[PDB]
Design a protein around this ligand. Sequence first.
Ligand SMILES: [Mg+2]
Length: 215
Amino acid sequence: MKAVLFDIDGTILTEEPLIMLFLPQVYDKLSRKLGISKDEARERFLSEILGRRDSYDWHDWNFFFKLFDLDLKYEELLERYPHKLQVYPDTIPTLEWLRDTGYKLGIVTSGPKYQRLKLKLTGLLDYFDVVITRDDVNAIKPEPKIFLYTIERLGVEPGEAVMVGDSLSQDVYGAKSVGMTAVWINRNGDRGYNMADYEIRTLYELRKILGGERV
Ligand SMILES: [Mg+2]
């Protein structure tokens, strides 16, 4: 192997604490705006998200803010509350080890350009040789172009790359479809459907999968 590619959300960090902080503010603003209760605003907001799953737009918080004409920008929430982005303890030792060993490191994410800001705010950005978001290729995983553009920029072949992520449909199916090795990270005891090449609970497990040999 010559390169390891990473998903962001649920893989190297989680934005769930930020979500828990801003969702009540969304429900408040939605309630004010539409003349409905906060509980009904919650229903409408979450319903719209559910209705958009498996689509391009599902991946962008700003899409949902804009859809309801709310006075919120996800970039501003990120800048204001960066401590609500939680980096998993297994992330930095693994990136350090991979970088030192000579592996090229990439990001492949279906989220929009603010995904790069998330990496900067969590001190993760500089580990990666290339970072590709939905907004860079106008596509989402598992579309082949988002994977292929990333490895093109890294200068490696698909068979020389490993993809690591927490989505069976985006990450595992997407990576395998273009000839990469696919690792599924399963932090919460979910069902794997017998798909990925490897299934791990933390990124520390990549050491025993890849071996210690320098690239
Ligand atoms: Mg993910």
